[PDB]
Swiss-Prot record, chain E:
Membrane topology per record: Multi-pass membrane protein
Sorted UniProt keywords: Electron transport, Membrane, Mitochondrion, Mitochondrion inner membrane, NAD, Respiratory chain, Translocase, Transmembrane, Transmembrane helix, Transport, Ubiquinone
Location(s) in or outside the cell: Mitochondrion inner membrane
Transmembrane segments: 22-42, 60-80, 98-118, 147-167, 196-216, 224-244, 256-276, 284-303, 308-330, 351-371, 391-411
Official protein name in the record: NADH-ubiquinone oxidoreductase chain 4
Entry's Gene Ontology cellular component terms: mitochondrial inner membrane; respiratory chain complex I
Gene Ontology molecular function: NADH dehydrogenase (ubiquinone) activity; ubiquinone binding
Enzyme class name: translocase
GO BP terms: electron transport coupled proton transport; mitochondrial electron transport, NADH to ubiquinone; mitochondrial respiratory chain complex I assembly
Protein's gene: MT-ND4
Swiss-Prot record, chain F:
Subunit details: Core subunit of respiratory chain NADH dehydrogenase (Complex I) which is composed of 45 different subunits.
Domain of life: Eukaryota
Residues of the full protein shown: 1 to 56 of 606
Subcellular location: Mitochondrion inner membrane
Task of the protein: Core subunit of the mitochondrial membrane respiratory chain NADH dehydrogenase (Complex I) which catalyzes electron transfer from NADH through the respiratory chain, using ubiquinone as an electron acceptor. Essential for the catalytic activity and assembly of complex I.
Segments passing through the bilayer: 4-24, 43-56
Annotated family: Belongs to the complex I subunit 5 family.
Protein's name in the database: NADH-ubiquinone oxidoreductase chain 5
């Protein structure tokens, strides 16, 4: 003697195939789905992925890497060629330091 | 590893091993026989026969069936079920 | 000839040596009849809603749904804080945490005091 | 736990014991001749008191038989390489594809195999043509207010197919 | 940086004044264009950060996360159809513009300079997540999910504001540089303990730490796929980014006051990897997986080694990609059967014989197969914590074992052994889900080749 | 030796064509088992040489 | 009169996707690799000299590779 509802019986399971056997991703509009495929590849791989692969495969020395290689090369060659010990400890000059006293 | 089984062939192999069995005769050995009516042998040696088929062909048959074969034709039918006998 | 197969929480008791299967009263016959009847009706409903040629979706078992809703969402109702619940809660939730806490204090105070002495093997320990 | 009735019986219970003990005696006993000897010995041991008009002493001897069996089984009972438990256990299940597929193919490949799909389509029309009336009338027609069995009657009425047969007939071929 | 801000704005009236079968191409195409546009950013070098204005700047912590955001938007926007294409046009447009405003506040948040501005953009990151998951939460408790969500995030993130205003009017302005160059150490009075506790506890809530992870599982099992990917990847690594910055201040008391949180994180990492071994609701296993990886993140943040921060940022980016991918695969399976449960949908090595390739690939990244980034992260964090103590490797290795076993259980449970053969409705794989998998797992392997980009400031 | 290093690195890299081959072919080669067997044989004959140089 | 009929899931949609993927990466995988091969076979990398006396460079004229 009661129902509490009035709506459609749910769901309506649409196979997105069985009206298009050629169909790509979304709903049954035929051509613009092919455009979706073509844009998400051709502007998603064909312009993004391989160009990003080149662009990050090399660029300059990110955080000064090979600069540091050759700079350390020249500095250690200098500190061999002038006798003084390589990598002096006490990186700041002890003449320009002032210990507080007791 | 697939020689094809066929219905005449499975009939011949099953009747070969029944005929080799001792306490039956090669005279009253029919395809449409009974292990209960006319061969008259007991349930015990009936399951010895079931053991012979399992040990020849290489697979168990379950005890839901070994109650209820009781004739050679249904034996051939049941290995036809397990093997799906067409080429 | 045999010590009669003491069971466990792991070793299942097999079908043969129950020995309750041999005291068949009429109640066990009654129970096995009704249990077969229940299995019969459920396979009937399932097979009719399994072999429909129009039935596109899945058969949507209420048993699995009922188990899942019992397992996750029907925990927090229902509950009362008992002695057993509170006791096991503070044991298996706080016990290991506070134990691991004290042992890492102990290891860290050892290593801090020991390198405060300076006699540790950090002659070259750069990758800290 | 079986589809036909509510229990095995005494008879088939003893029978399954005899099958198991004979199988374990295979798994214990190589060389096949001493196997044959011990098999006839075991058959004689069941022949000693086959003909008890008693029943309660028979089932007590059944229980003591199960004790001396389970004491004397094998660590690897010889399971066949087709049985569950065994070496196969749906071994070539890699290709046991159900046949609700193969209709969701692109019509290029439905052009690749034409006759098969024509006859498959008349199979599905055979199914739907006799689905409603005969099958569901035969199911809601015969049984008791509860079904209380797991068998089902055949279609002895006149013509067409026994009910509820599609997933029985259309199965994998067990060696593809 | 306004060169990135303003086309992300102007992608919004785009979506309004396009029509049916016309919004989609514009949004997706132009969002990919913005992805190239921020691939242009990565210049960052040497001495310091790089300053995009008197107002914006980029640390090299912020560059990979920012590029990850602008990568993850078009993927998401393709991913969130077929479960709403049959709803109305106006509601669909509102959905797309909601995500674009979301991305806009995420870029605002990652390129912050002032921590107060960071806080405003933190909760402006919050409010679209709420509206998406509540309006399309798609199950009966999306109510409770949103409610738990917003009250945990605000009521944890509320006193963080008070602590930052107090620091503002005790140490001048709040550039990250003038937070640096002027920070002086602060000793162990109890006010310092509460101030540290306020800041670190708000971001602890947003990671999650272990005692506050039941924020998470409702807020991912009852979300749509877009908000789930957003929430997992961008929001959890956003919380980690915040703690990574503001841990620059208050180093002289973090040692004395960091002991309970590490131990909470370790025993909770073990417990969370254990609790995702036995649950149903396959969608939630990825959520508890995410709590496991974030617990390892928190271990890496509270220990303060440069080794630890390198491992932390790599673990951030790799787990973001893994979890976002794996959520998208679980949505594919739920589009197949209307279950969400684990033990139901089975088989599928036979059917869809290349969906399983993507399941295998993501499952082995979540295993941390070794050339991938996630092993780089986990390995350096284990190295840094073993230099922290000679004992913690029991916990890390046992995490590795249980992580292996639940991840493999996800693989071979639902997609191995036997189809239940009363399914008979699953379609062969669309091009779209294959495209989504392709957009996840090309950059993960491409960073697996050359990973010197994604390591942190302490490179 | 340039011969030594050259032959060892090509014993590596000969095991790298066929995976990329059927990842890139999509026209199902009938000769695929024969192909993998013959590249393993060629890797063998390249690997016999520098080991004998090593013992030499 | 020997052969049987296997039951496959499909080949169509799967091989169509992979064919599209190799075509749409390869359509700019090929000309870029051709381009960079022409770059390091014609245009030169760079040379390793030092700072000329009183001639400040650009912020380029600093790097080995010409595309960088
Ligand atoms: C530029 C880089 C990307 C280029 C991709 C171009 C397209 C390649 C393609 O279509 O390949 C066909 C192949 C599918 O082959 P199919 O014949 O169509 O069907 C095979 C079945 O589906 C069955 O699937 P399956 O057996 O092919 O799945 C195997 C799966 C299993 O994964 C693994 O084995 C990973 C562990 C590898 C060893 C680690 C040491 O993947 C691999 O073996 C990949 C190993 C290489 C990863 C590291 C490089 O595509 C894929 O496997 C998907 C792409 C996977 C990434 C490729 C990255 C290459 C670098
Ligand atoms: C958790 C509460 C965090 C409140 C903000 C952080 C803070 O400064 O707390 C210290 C506050 C108050 O400490 P306080 O900030 O007044 O510290 C003393 C500051 N002088 C010396 C300038 C007066 O602690 C609480 O209110 C306890 C809660
Ligand atoms: C470290 C940081 C920890 C921060 C913790 C903050 C509080 C925790 C989250 C509060 C909200 C909890 C929640 O959502 O609970 C659900 C409950 C409503 O549930 P129910 O009673 O079923 O109502 C159904 C209505 N038809 O909701 C309620 O009953 C809400 C009750 C009020 C909560 C307001 C927020 C907290 C304020 C605390 C002030 C002291």
């Amino acid at each position: 003697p009661t129902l509490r509802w009035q709506e459609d019986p749910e769901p309506e399971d649409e196979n997105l195939y069985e009206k298009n056997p050629d169909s790509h991703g979304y709903d049954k509009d035929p051509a613009v789905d092919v455009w979706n495929m073509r844009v998400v590849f051709f502007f998603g791989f064909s312009i993004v992925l391989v160009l990003g692969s080149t662009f990050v495969a090399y660029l300059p020395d990110y955080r000064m890497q090979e600069w540091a290689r050759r700079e350390a090369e020249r500095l250690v060659k200098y500190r061999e060629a002038h006798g003084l010990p390589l990598m002096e400890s006490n990186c700041f000059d002890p003449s320009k330091i002032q210990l507080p006293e007791d | 590893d697939a020689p094809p089984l066929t219905l005449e062939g499975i009939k011949d192999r099953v009747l070969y091993v029944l005929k080799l069995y001792d306490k039956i005769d090669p005279e009253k050995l029919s395809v449409n026989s009974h292990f209960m009516k006319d061969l008259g042998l007991d349930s015990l040696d009936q399951v010895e026969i079931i053991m012979a088929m399992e040990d020849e062909f290489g697979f168990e048959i379950p005890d839901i069936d070994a109650e209820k074969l009781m004739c050679p034709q249904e034996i051939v039918d049941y290995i036809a079920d397990k093997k799906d006998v067409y080429e | 000839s045999f010590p009669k197969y003491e069971p466990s929480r792991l070793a299942s008791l097999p079908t043969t040596l129950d020995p309750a299967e041999y005291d068949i009263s009429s109640e066990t016959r009654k129970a096995q009849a009704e249990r077969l009847a229940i299995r019969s009706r459920l396979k009937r409903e399932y097979q009719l809603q399994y072999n429909d040629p129009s039935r596109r979706g899945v058969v949507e078992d209420p048993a699995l749904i009922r188990w899942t809703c019992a397992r996750s969402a029907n925990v927090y109702p229902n509950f009362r804080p008992n002695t057993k619940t509170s006791l096991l809660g503070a044991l298996f939730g706080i016990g290991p945490l506070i134990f691991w806490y004290y042992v890492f204090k102990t290891d860290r105070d050892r290593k801090e005091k020991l390198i405060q002495e300076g006699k540790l093997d950090r002659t070259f320990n750069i990758s800290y | 736990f079986l589809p036909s009735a509510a229990y095995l019986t005494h008879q088939q219970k003893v029978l399954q014991l005899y099958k198991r003990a004979l199988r374990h005696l295979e798994s214990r006993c190589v060389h096949r001749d001493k196997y044959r000897y011990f098999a006839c010995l075991l058959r004689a041991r069941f022949d000693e008191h086959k003909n008890e008009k008693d029943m309660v002493k028979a089932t007590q001897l059944l229980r003591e038989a199960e004790k001396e069996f389970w004491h004397g089984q094998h660590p690897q009972p010889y399971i066949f390489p087709e049985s569950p438990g065994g070496t196969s256990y749906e071994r070539y299940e890699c290709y046991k594809v159900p046949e609700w597929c193969l209709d969701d193919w692109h019509p290029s490949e439905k052009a690749m195999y034409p006759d098969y799909f024509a006859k498959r389509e008349q199979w599905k029309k055979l199914r739907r043509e006799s689905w409603e009336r005969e099958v569901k009338q035969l199911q809601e027609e015969t049984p008791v207010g509860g079904p209380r069995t797991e068998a089902l009657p055949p279609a002895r009425k006149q013509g067409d197919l026994p009910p509820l047969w599609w997933h029985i007939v259309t199965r994998p071929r067990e060696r593809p | 940086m306004l060169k990135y801000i303003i086309p992300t704005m102007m992608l919004m009236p785009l979506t309004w004044l396009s029509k049916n079968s016309m919004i989609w191409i514009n949004t997706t195409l132009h969002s990919l264009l913005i992805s190239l546009t921020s691939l242009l950013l990565l210049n960052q070098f040497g001495d310091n950060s790089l300053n995009f204005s008197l107002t914006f700047f980029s640390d090299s912590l912020s560059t990979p996360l920012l590029i990850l955001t602008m990568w993850l938007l078009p993927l998401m926007l393709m991913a969130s159809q077929h479960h709403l294409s049959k709803e109305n046009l106006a509601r669909k447009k509102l959905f797309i513009s909601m995500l674009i405003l979301l991305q806009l506040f995420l870029i605002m948040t990652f390129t912050a300079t002032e921590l107060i501005f960071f806080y405003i953009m933190f909760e402006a990151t919050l409010v679209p997540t709420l509206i998406i998951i509540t309006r399309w939460g798609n199950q009966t408790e999306r109510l409770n999910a949103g409610l738990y969500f917003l009250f945990y995030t605000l009521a944890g993130s509320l006193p963080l504001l008070v602590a930052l205003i107090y620091i503002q009017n005790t140490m001048g302005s709040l550039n990250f540089l003038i937070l640096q160059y002027w920070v002086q150490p602060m000793p162990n009075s109890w006010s310092n303990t509460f101030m540290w506790l306020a800041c670190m506890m708000a971001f602890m809530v947003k990671m999650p730490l272990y005692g506050l992870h039941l924020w998470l599982p409702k807020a991912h099992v009852e979300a749509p796929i877009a908000g789930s990917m957003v929430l997992a990847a961008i929001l959890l690594k956003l919380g980690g980014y915040g703690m990574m910055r503001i841990t620059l201040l208050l180093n002289p008391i973090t040692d004395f006051m960091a002991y309970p949180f590490i131990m909470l994180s370790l025993w909770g990492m073990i417990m969370t990897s254990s609790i995702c071994l036995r649950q149903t609701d396959l969608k939630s296993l990825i959520a508890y997986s995410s709590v496991s990886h974030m617990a390892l993140v928190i271990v890496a943040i509270l220990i303060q080694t440069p080794w630890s921060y390198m491992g932390a940022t790599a673990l951030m980016i790799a787990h973001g990609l893994t979890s976002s991918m794996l959520f998208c695969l679980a949505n594919s399976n739920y589009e197949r059967v209307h279950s969400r449960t684990m033990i139901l949908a089975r088989g599928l090595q036979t059917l869809l014989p290349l969906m399983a390739a993507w399941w295998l690939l993501a499952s082995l990244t979540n295993l941390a197969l070794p050339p991938s980034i996630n092993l780089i992260g986990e390995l350096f964090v284990v190295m840094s914590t073993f230099s922290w103590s000679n004992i913690t490797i029991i916990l890390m290795g046992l995490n590795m074992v249980i992580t292996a076993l639940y991840s493999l259980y996800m693989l071979i449970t639902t997609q191995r052994g036997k189809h239940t053969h009363h399914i008979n409705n699953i379609l062969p794989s669309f091009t779209r889900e294959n495209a989504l998998m392709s957009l996840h797992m090309l950059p993960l392997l491409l960073l697996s080749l050359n990973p010197k980009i994604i390591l942190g400031p302490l490179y | 030796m340039n011969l030594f290093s050259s032959l060892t690195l090509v014993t590596l890299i000969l095991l790298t064509m066929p995976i990329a081959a059927i990842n890139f072919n999509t026209h199902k080669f009938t000769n695929y088992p024969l192909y993998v067997k013959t590249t393993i044989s060629c890797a063998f004959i390249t690997s016999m040489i520098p080991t004998m140089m090593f013992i030499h | 009169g020997k052969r049987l009929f296997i039951i496959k899931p499909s080949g169509f949609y799967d091989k169509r996707f992979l064919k599209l993927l190799r075509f749409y990466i390869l359509l700019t995988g090929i000309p870029v690799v051709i381009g960079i091969t022409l770059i390091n076979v014609f245009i030169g990398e760079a040379e390793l000299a030092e700072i000329p006396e009183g001639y400040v460079p650009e912020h380029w004229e600093y790097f080995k590779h010409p595309i960088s």
